[PDB]
Design a protein around this nucleic acid. Structure first.
Lengths: 64, 201, 143, 117
RNA sequence: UAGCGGCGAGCGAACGGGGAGCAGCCCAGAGCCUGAAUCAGUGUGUGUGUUAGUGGAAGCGUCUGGAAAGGCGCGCGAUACAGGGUGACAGCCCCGUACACAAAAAUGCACAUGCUGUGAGCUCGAUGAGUAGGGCGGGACACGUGGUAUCCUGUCUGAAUAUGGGGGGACCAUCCUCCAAGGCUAAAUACUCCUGACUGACCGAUAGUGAACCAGUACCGUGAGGGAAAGGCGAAAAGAACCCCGGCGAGGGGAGUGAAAAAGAACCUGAAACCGUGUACGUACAAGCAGUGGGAGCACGCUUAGGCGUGUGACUGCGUACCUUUUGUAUAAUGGGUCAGCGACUUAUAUUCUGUAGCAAGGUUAACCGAAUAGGGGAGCCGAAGGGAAACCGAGUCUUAACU
């Protein structure tokens, strides 16, 4: 066989220039009027997947 | 570089990159092991537990006999039972890169020149298709174990070397690493030398 | 000399054989510890499985879409276009030089190093820096 | 390439059973018991290459203590005496002189009492 | 990969590219015109193949040996040194192999040809209706009804018919492309009950078929069904005339054959467990993982007594098996009566890292063609450029009205 991508991980991480993975932050979909604008403004840019989790991500995304 | 002809006493001008480079023993070893691996007809199969001619009936009840628990009479622990990791027919070919194959031929040709196992004759043909004539001809040239390689495959030479054990006649196209290394002396026609340089660039 | 050829030093590493004896290092448990799901034949959990905690690829939101059009755009360096056989650059003349691909419809002439010959670029987008680099080394860009 | 394993297994078993000649019963006949007997003999042999140094030393001390008390001094006072007399004869040799040469041992006791006083 | 997906687990295309192979036609329909290509069915002739076959090279002496093909010495064949047998290992002893030939008869294939059937070609016309589409239910499409195109239809309906209709992924318009509701069609392709030849870093009698042997047998089961074990004397039966013990036995001892009968049919080798006979030593006042360290004596061999070696081992210090599981086992926790044979980290394909080898801003081909492990084949893949959700920009880019 040929390795299948964990497909719902491809919709959530995207590869960068030096091999790290970017992802959208959690907590910014609903319940929102209770949150400060400082939270929400700091959750909008995309973020790098941390060191702990790259193992998991590279396992799920073997072609990206 | 020049190759001294045996009979005409000329010198054939060759490439130093083809007939005068170093012996890369690791490269040659990879191409030799790969050539020999390509020859394996990998035909075999043992029967796994699934293919052994039996039944899937469980031989005794799971509990209460004092026997060890068993589930199939085709278990690999049982006599008559089915190989655990039974083999299948497999392909043993290795990829050799083209530049590694050509590199290996350049190394072995350079060492056949360097060890005086490479003889360059101008013409090498037999009169009639007789093994007696080729036996006498190789006897006159002090050669017993020999790989004759000719740029144009003569029919009579091919029929004359077909019974001689140590002797093998090839065209310049179909040479392999294991025969240049296998045979004691290689006798190339000058035309075969030119065709070899055209092959190996 | 087929019994004198020998591989390189370091190329053929041995291969772990598990389950043979005490001296070998990997006998009884073969290097897989005591009981558990991981010491079992077939045993192991699936990819991105954190016990039952919601996995990383499933507690983070999904973003974006795939373009359809970025799969037919290309990106030409300046190291090529000395490779086009002609000194004239269109989408064909690049396709013919095995440099973009047949499905490609859009191309762009990014500064990525060292154009020398005078090249006439036709119908391709060119970046700013590479417009200066094509026009500086003779060159011509029309569209 | 099927490898039958009869000949080499026979050689290993036989190696172990030759190392167990003289053992009682199955310990010298059956492989599965002679293997344990041979190993336990190995562990004892290790352990006892250390104990023979301890056992010989306590034998020698008992003989020097006997012969020295025969010459009117204890072992403790005799070794203190000879160390103060700066005699470095070890006690294998003092035990052996104390058996074979009674007069030399008497003279050693005189050095010990001479320095000890 | 795009996508589908309790957007989970998973499922997973097409476009387009490279190859293998390549072949188009007929009816719905009349007239002109006929046998005009076409195939099908048969006869005959030729060629080739199958079903029996034929010829097929070239050696002797001497030594060991039961026996020579082996050793040594000297010759010959080879378009034939593939293989098998022959009293040990044979190119030249035998069967064969290379090579060259062979069919009265029956046949397969391919041309040619006779007859029958069949219809070419031209002009004009027609150009597939309960159908396409729709509503409801379901299914197939990678696509789970979703914004879902498309196909199939169980049910209810229902057109236009070349100034027409289908598709182009909801849908409309413009543009492009194609002609459903009739049918036939070789090759590339898949498979091996069965036959022949050849091959194996496949097995060698607990393996390989369940089955090397009168094996799907014996045997088990009412039945469907399940399903064994079991090969090897010798080169040749020359397989033991005859005599003795013995129950006109069984078994044996001689004799004889044989190179060898502890090669005798319970037959090559002949292990281990297990059981004996004989010899040396120890052992009947001594407590326990049965050894180990020390160690007297005795018996055999030596040995220019050199005071060693082998066997035994009184007596003595120390010493509660192995596995497994466990915080922890002499544990009175698990497992094992013993021996012998078998018995468990493999294989394939992807991806990542390390070693190593080639080439290097390049590396490499896949299918396939194939003088065929060569060489072609660069379709493609990976890398040399990133940023952004994306358009887009590009050594920058995104954010933001703009960024110290």
């Amino acid at each position: 066989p040929k390795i299948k991508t964990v497909r719902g991980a491809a919709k959530r991480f995207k590869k960068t220039g030096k091999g790290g993975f970017k992802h959208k932050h959690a907590n910014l979909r609903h319940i929102l009027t209770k949150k400060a604008t400082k939270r929400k403004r700091h959750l909008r840019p995309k973020a790098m997947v941390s060191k702990g989790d790259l193992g998991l991500v590279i396992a799920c995304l073997p072609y990206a | 570089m020049e190759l001294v002809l045996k009979d005409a006493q000329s010198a054939l001008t060759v490439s130093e990159t083809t007939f005068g480079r170093d012996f890369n023993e690791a490269l040659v070893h990879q191409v030799v092991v790969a050539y020999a691996a390509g020859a394996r007809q990998g035909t075999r199969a043992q029967k796994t537990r699934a293919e052994v001619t039996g039944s899937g009936k469980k031989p005794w009840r799971q509990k209460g006999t004092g026997r060890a628990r068993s589930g199939s009479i085709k278990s690999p622990i049982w006599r008559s039972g089915g190989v655990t990791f039974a083999a299948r027919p497999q392909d043993h070919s290795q990829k050799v890169n083209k530049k590694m194959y050509r590199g290996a031929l350049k190394s072995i040709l350079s060492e056949l020149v360097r060890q005086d196992r490479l003889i360059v004759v101008e013409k090498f043909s037999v009169e009639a298709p007789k093994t007696k004539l080729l036996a006498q001809k190789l006897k006159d040239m002090a050669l017993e174990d020999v790989l004759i390689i000719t740029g144009e495959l003569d029919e009579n030479l091919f029929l004359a070397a077909r019974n001689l054990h140590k002797v093998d006649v090839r065209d310049a196209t179909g040479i392999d690493p294991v025969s240049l290394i296998a045979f004691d002396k290689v006798v190339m026609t000058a035309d075969a030398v030119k065709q070899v340089e055209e092959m190996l660039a | 000399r087929l019994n004198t050829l020998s591989p390189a030093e370091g190329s053929k590493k041995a291969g772990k054989r598990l389950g043979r004896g005490i001296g070998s290092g990997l006998g009884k448990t073969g290097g897989r510890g005591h009981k558990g799901q991981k010491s079992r034949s077939g045993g192991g959990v699936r990819r991105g499985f954190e016990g039952g905690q919601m996995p990383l690829y499933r507690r983070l939101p999904k973003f974006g879409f795939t373009s359809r059009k970025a799969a037919i755009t290309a990106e030409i360096r300046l190291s090529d276009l000395a490779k086009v056989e002609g000194g004239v650059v269109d989408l064909n003349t690049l396709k013919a030089a095995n440099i973009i691909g047949i499905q490609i419809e859009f191309a762009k002439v990014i500064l990525a190093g060292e154009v020398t010959t005078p090249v006439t670029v036709r119908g391709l987008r060119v970046t700013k820096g590479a417009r200066a680099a094509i026009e500086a080394a003779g060159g011509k860009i029309e569209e | 390439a099927r490898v039958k394993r009869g000949v080499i297994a026979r050689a290993r078993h036989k190696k172990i059973l030759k190392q167990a000649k003289g053992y009682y019963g199955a310990r010298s006949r059956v492989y599965r018991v002679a293997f344990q007997a041979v190993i336990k003999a190995g562990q004892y042999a290790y352990r006892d290459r250390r104990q023979r140094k301890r056992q010989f030393r306590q034998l020698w001390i008992a003989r020097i203590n006997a012969a020295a008390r025969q010459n009117g001094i204890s072992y403790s006072k005799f070794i203190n005496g000879l160390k103060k007399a700066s005699v470095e004869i070890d006690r294998k040799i003092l035990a052996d002189i104390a058996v074979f040469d009674k007069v030399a041992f008497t003279a050693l006791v005189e050095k010990a009492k001479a320095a000890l006083a």
